Amino acid sequence: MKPDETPMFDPSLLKEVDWSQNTATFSPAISPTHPGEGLVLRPLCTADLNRGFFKVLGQLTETGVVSPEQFMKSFEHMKKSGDYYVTVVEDVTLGQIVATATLIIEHKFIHSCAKRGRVEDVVVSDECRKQLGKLLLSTLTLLSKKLNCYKITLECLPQNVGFYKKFGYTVSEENYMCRRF
Amino acid sequence: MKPDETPMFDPSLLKEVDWSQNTATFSPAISPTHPGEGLVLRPLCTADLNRGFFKVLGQLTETGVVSPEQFMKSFEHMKKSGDYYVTVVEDVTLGQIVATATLIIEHKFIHSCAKRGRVEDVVVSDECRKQLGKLLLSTLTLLSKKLNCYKITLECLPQNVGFYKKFGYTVSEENYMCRRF
Q: Tell me, what's a Pfam family for it (chains A, B)?
């Protein structure tokens, strides 16, 4: 039970995607396979722990004091389900995570027992203002349409609506309601 | 692999909840244990298939042609995860489902590896205009705060915002964006 290089899902699944079906604009043109010079687009592994993964998460929102056992426990149950796709971009020649986004598969009974996707926890490093945000969002979206998700949704503040539209997301009429404890 | 009376989760988990911590108004006063005359509040079992479960789902939104094997497959993987809580109200003296709502647990790395809840697929039968909607929403919400979810969210159209507020949900500033395929 110690951090290693085991991924959460089959890496080939990211290189397997129909990148011809990309909606976004890329200049210079990049891909899942070749995401940028120095860069690796892959699944999250437990070793990423050391490599700034929380440094990057900590930009988007609170990450408290995270123990190693709690992170591997969380990861293990995420790997176990097959429903989580935490997807990271590492700057290889630094040993540092520079971007993350999560795909989540919800299983449903409606629309003839369809699956649906949720995009969570999207953050690009302060450092890399390298086209990662586009790359992650277009990759994950396309993965969802291949894991036979009928739809995929996400929540985001107004300022970011425009960003998400380049992937063919649109504003729904439905409000988002929350309650903490 | 045939429909039976096995629940998706431990039924005691619904009767276990801190019903004193209820936010909603009930006249006459009902509970998870005693949900109404004739009624049972419990987990979804695969036998529910026969018992109008889709009749009720079909009110909220499309359910296409659903095979038995696809429903048990979906159910099985939902049971397997521990993260799904499809929760049903059956009118016992009819063999009929009259209400459903789903709790879903998302595992995260943020807020020190917290869990969060999602309320999905809320429908009360055309027949029972018996306090079920309140009962389900207050039960599930309370379950979430006990499965150590730091928060719980849902999406809903404007007309239903007021309904959700009696459970201590509130409008977030975040838009809801969708894309189908």
A: Acetyltransf_1
Asked whether A44 and A88 are in contact (CB, 8 A), the reply is: yes
Amino acid at B169: Y
> CA–CA separation, B153 vs B105, rounded Å?
10
Residue closest to B54 by CA, chosen among B86, B14, B10, B12:
B86
| CB A122, CB A133: distance < 8 Å | yes
Q: How many CB atoms lie within 10 A of CB B123?
A: 20
What are the CA-CA distances from residue A70 to residues A98, B62, B82 (Å)?
Answer: 23, 39, 17
Task: Classify residue A9 by its DSSP letter.
Answer: S
The 3-state DSSP composition of chain A as helix, strand, coil percent (nearest 5) reads 35, 30, 35
- Resolution in Å, one decimal place: 2.7
Which domains occur in chain A, in start order? 10-169 (3.40.630.30)
Contact B109 A66 (CB under 8 A): yes
For residue A141, the chain B residues in CB contact (below 8 A) are 179
DSSP per-residue string spanning chain B: ----S-BSS-THHHHTS-GGG--S--SS---SSS-STTEEEEE-BGGGGGGTHHHHHHHHS------HHHHHHHHHHHHHHS-EEEEEEEEGGGTEEEEEEEEEEEE-SHHHH-EEEEEEEEEE-TT----HHHHHHHHHHHHHTTTTEEEEEEEE-GGGHHHHHTTT-EE-S-EEEEEE-
Dihedral angle computed from the Cα positions of residues B90, B119, A81 and A155, in that order, rounded to the nearest 10 degrees: 160
Contacts of A153 in chain B (CB under 8 A): 155, 176-179
Query: Tokens 């309320």, residue?
Result: B119
DSSP 8-state secondary structure symbol assigned to residue A108: -
Dihedral pair phi/psi, residue B26, rounded to 5°:
-130, 115
Token pair of B103 as six digits: 């709790």
Helix then strand count (H, E) for chain A reads 6, 7
Q: Is A69 on the interface with B (CB under 8 A)?
A: no
